[PDB]
Amino acid sequence: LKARGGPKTLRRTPGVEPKDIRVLPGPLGSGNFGTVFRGVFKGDQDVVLKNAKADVMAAEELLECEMDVNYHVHANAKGTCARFMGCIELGAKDGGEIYNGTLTEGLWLMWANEGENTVEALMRRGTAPLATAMACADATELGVTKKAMRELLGSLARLHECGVVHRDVKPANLIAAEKDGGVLKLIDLGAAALCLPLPETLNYYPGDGPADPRYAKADELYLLPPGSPRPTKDNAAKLWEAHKPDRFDSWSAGCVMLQLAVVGLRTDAGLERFLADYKAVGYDVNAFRGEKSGEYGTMDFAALDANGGAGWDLCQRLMEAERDARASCEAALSHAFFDAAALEHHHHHH
Amino acid sequence: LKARGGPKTLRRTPGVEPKDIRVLPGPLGSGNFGTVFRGVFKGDQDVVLKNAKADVMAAEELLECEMDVNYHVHANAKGTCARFMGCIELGAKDGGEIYNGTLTEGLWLMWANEGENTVEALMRRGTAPLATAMACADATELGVTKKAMRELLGSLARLHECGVVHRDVKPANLIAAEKDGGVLKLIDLGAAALCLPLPETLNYYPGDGPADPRYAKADELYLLPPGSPRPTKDNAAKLWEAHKPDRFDSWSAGCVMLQLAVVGLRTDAGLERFLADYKAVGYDVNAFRGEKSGEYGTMDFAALDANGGAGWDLCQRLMEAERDARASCEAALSHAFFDAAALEHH
Ligand SMILES: Nc1ncnc2c1ncn2[C@@H]1O[C@H](COP(=O)(O)OP(=O)(O)O)[C@@H](O)[C@H]1O
Ligand SMILES: Nc1ncnc2c1ncn2[C@@H]1O[C@H](COP(=O)(O)OP(=O)(O)O)[C@@H](O)[C@H]1O
Ligand SMILES: [Mg+2]
Ligand SMILES: [Mg+2]
Ligand SMILES: [Mg+2]
């Protein structure tokens, strides 16, 4: 006798058919376990498409987790991240060729194209183009830092509230969404963890990595430190309070703040130099100011200096050496840095 | 009192200076731990350049190990891999911009550009363009499989002899070098281990490590099993014999052979299907042929069937479930599959 075989099963999102997706050749970035392409959906919708790298161990599992977290965020934290449009799974015979503009065999994720420029690209062109893209009236380092950080910290607080730690916060993963007033949206949940049993934790484990070493604290490349009881439904809440994995994002947000606030820190080399001196003085912002800032004559810390050094203090809060001392993104939101000035806008007010 | 500054120490290769190198925009790799670009050295030498990804944990350390292994291979197994032209290290102030043709900050490795096409790209275009690139006179599946596997196994044997296990053998990491008769050369020693103390082992440790899930044996993603002692200069030889880490490459070479020999196995899904069935029948090639091959009506296994199933037998040896049963690349090289034709009547 012979084995009967049977049909293939393919994952799909209602209203999203592969025939309606044209993929544009040319990856949008090196990528972690996946590759991102521009596409056009139904002839006139600009989208971004991601599949797994064939050469990376368990990339399909990582893409599945990214998919799961994206569904979670879509349901619980709308507007924090790029709009998630679902998945499309293609088989072998129906799989196409990127050069022919068709989706290849395997699982794909799709999002709205939120804009052609990241905060990293904009900030490096200058504060002016960054402010314009952000629709930020105060086109100064202080102005863009206030507006961007309010948006970023607000979104991170909302993500943390539904149990999601992004784990890859940085200017490169922020887009000023021109179709939503220039508001910042996060992209790339490929490293994100769901840290509460809602209903099951995802991508949540003890140990280092993944982490962008530019934006993760050098001796804190983990969400959970190794050894600690692996995350289960039982201990999830306890681990959250004890190990504070969300504070991983706090540190990264502090890095975002430094780069927004200080032009000279917008290069990898600039931020690296600062963080090295910061560490050297015991992660003490005032000690940096007292001992080191004098060696930064090519830079301008005015945005951090302003209003009694409010920005410096917010940086200190977000970038405390110890997680037990480090501000949550939610707490960081109520900081004086975000206060309206006395009588602000008085000259035009009704 | 203020702490004094001092010089920055940079690594350099004699004969290779920053002003000698122009980088061309457009990355070539899948971009895991490093980024690869084409470049031009001294105005008219085509080269390839690799730097560490700034956004990946331990990227520079991974590149440093790839550098060390490249020097070892350059010294001990010339011709097995792309020609290694050394390194160039640059500082931040002293770094440029890729889109402006200049090397950016950090360590860079440089190799000769060995050719524009990998075996993965060629085989997927077809046996004909693959054979042409290989200067392979017998432009059939059997012909390209014989020539390619002789070259690949010969090179792996030479690497193994000097203690190197490549650990990323696959068609995407083979280039047909037109300038050298079309011979296949390995690229990408980024996952490689030095398994002998010369003077120390490199990237060699117990347990799972880097692997391409298509080309590494799924239940065998290690060079040394998880229970193995850490390698030392004193036990390295014992561990080599006991755990046969080179047999990791043997399995991958078997996968290469399957794709060269059978057109339908050249897609990822094709080879994945075969390996699933192969595992299901106990890693037994004859059981595959008897129980499973009838399900593969769209494929042609003639190259493996030929000459008493010589190809199938060589695959079986390269792909035994147990390392202790699996052929070394050196032993495989002497297989009947590579025998000269008798009585050719010239
Ligand atoms: N929803 C989106 N809208 C617009 N651009 C996007 C979106 N998602 C991702 N991108 C762009 O795709 C690129 C993907 O790069 P990525 O996969 O992050 O690799 P890397 O981290 O090496 O840059 C990024 O430059 C990003 O700006
Ligand atoms: N010496 C070389 N000559 C020609 N092309 C090369 C050479 N080395 C690498 N390449 C090309 O660059 C790509 C990436 O190089 P590789 O070392 O395989 O890094 P990775 O696979 O990690 O991206 C290869 O797939 C190949 O196309
Ligand atoms: Mg990314
Ligand atoms: Mg695949
Ligand atoms: Mg490679």
Residue B148: which CATH number? 1.10.510.10
Partners of residue A194 on adjacent β-strands = A164, A202
Domain boundary among A82, A113, A144: A113
- Shortest alpha-carbon distance between residue A229 and chain B (Å): 22
Nearest CA in chain B to A58: B213
Confirm if A160 and A329 have CB atoms less than 8 A apart: yes
Q: How far apart are CA B288 and CA B273, in angstroms?
A: 12
Chain B hits for A172, Cβ within 8 Å:
55
Write out A160-220 in H/E/C secondary structure: HHCCEECCCCCHHHEEEEHHHCCEEEECCCCCCEECCCCCCCECCCECECCCCCCCCCCCC
**Whether residue A281 sits in one domain with residue A139:** yes
Q: How far apart are CA B2 and CA B20, in angstroms?
A: 38
Q: After which residues is chain A broken (C to N over 2.5 A)?
A: none
Segment (H or E) for A314: helix A302-318
Of B187, B212, B214, the one to substitute when testing ligand 2's pocket (max ligand atoms within 8 A of C-beta) is B187
Give the tokens for residue B173.
């990491």
**Whether residue A187 sits in one domain with residue A104:** no
Q: Which residue has the tokens 């890729």?
A: B98
Domain holding B202, by residue range, is: 114-346
Q: Find how far residue A199's CA is from the centre of its chain.
A: 23
**Whether residue B95 sits in one domain with residue B156:** no
Which residues make Cβ contacts (< 8 Å) with residue A140, sequence separation at least 6? A127, A131, A303
**Whether residue A90 sits in one domain with residue A226:** no
Resolution of this model in Å is 1.5
* Alpha helices, H only, chain B: 59-76, 119-125, 127-133, 141-161, 236-243, 247-261, 268-280, 285-287, 302-318, 329-333
Nearest CA in chain B to A272: B92
Domain boundary among B88, B113, B138: B113
**Whether residue B74 sits in one domain with residue B42:** yes
Chain A hits for B5, Cβ within 8 Å:
none
Confirm if A284 and A253 have CB atoms less than 8 A apart: no
Which phi and psi angles does B213 have, rounded to 5°? -65, -20
Chain A hits for B27, Cβ within 8 Å:
30
What total number of domains does chain B contain?
2
**Whether residue A276 sits in one domain with residue A289:** yes
Tell me if the bond preceding A199 is cis, omega within 30° of 0: yes
Q: How far apart are CA B58 and CA B32, in angstroms?
A: 12
Which phi and psi angles does A86 have, rounded to 5°? 110, -160
Which phi and psi angles does B40 have, rounded to 5°? -125, 125
Of A84, A168, A188, the one to substitute when testing ligand 1's pocket (max ligand atoms within 8 A of C-beta) is A188
**Whether residue A178 sits in one domain with residue A79:** no
φ/ψ region of B5 (left if φ > 0, alpha if ψ in -120 to 50, else beta) reads beta
Give the tokens for residue B203.
């990237």
Q: Ligand 1: which residues within 6 Å by Cβ?
A: A 28-31, 36, 48, 82, 111-115, 118, 175, 187-188; B 55
Which residues make Cβ contacts (< 8 Å) with residue A311, sequence separation at least 6? A142, A145, A257, A261, A303, A304, A305, A337
Chain A hits for B172, Cβ within 8 Å:
55
Counting every residue written for chain B, the total comes to 346
- Shortest alpha-carbon distance between residue A42 and chain B (Å): 28
Q: For residue A67, give the CATH number of its domain.
A: 3.30.200.20
Q: How far apart are CA A222 and CA A219, in angstroms?
A: 9
A334 is in an annotated binding site: no
**Whether residue B168 sits in one domain with residue B100:** no
Choosing from A55, A68, A138, A168, the catalytic residue is A168
At what angle are helices A246-261 and A302-318 packed, to 10 degrees? 170
Domain boundary among A113, A145, A180: A113
**Whether residue A301 sits in one domain with residue A232:** yes
Which phi and psi angles does A171 have, rounded to 5°? -55, -35
Q: How far apart are CA A175 and CA A172, in angstroms?
A: 8
A168 is in an annotated binding site: yes
- Shortest alpha-carbon distance between residue A213 and chain B (Å): 6
Partners of residue A112 on adjacent β-strands = A47
**Whether residue A334 sits in one domain with residue A216:** yes
CB pairs under 8 A between A and B: 65
Interface test with A, best of B36, B53, B55 (most A CBs within 10 A): B55
Closest CA to B204 of B169, B163, B170: B163
Partners of residue A37 on adjacent β-strands = A49
Residue ranges of A 67-126 with Cβ closer than 8 A to chain B: 92, 95, 105
Confirm if A245 and A264 have CB atoms less than 8 A apart: no
Q: In this complex, do B212 and A55 lie within 8 Å of one another by their Cβ atoms? A: yes
Ligand nearest to the CA of B38: 2
Confirm if A139 and A131 have CB atoms less than 8 A apart: yes
Work out the number of other CB atoms within 10 angstroms of the CB of residue A191. Answer: 24
Q: Residue A79 has what DSSP assignment?
A: T
A30 is in an annotated binding site: yes
Q: How far apart are CA B169 and CA A284, in angstroms?
A: 49
Residue B213 three-state SS = coil
Give the tokens for residue B18.
């920053």
Q: In this complex, do B54 and A3 lie within 8 Å of one another by their Cβ atoms? A: no
Residue B59 three-state SS = helix
Closest CA to B91 of B18, B20, B40, B35: B18
Tell me if the bond preceding B199 is cis, omega within 30° of 0: yes
**Whether residue B146 sits in one domain with residue B39:** no
Confirm if A18 and A90 have CB atoms less than 8 A apart: yes
The half-sphere exposure of B217 on its side-chain side, counting CA atoms within 13 A, is 24
**Whether residue A183 sits in one domain with residue A253:** yes
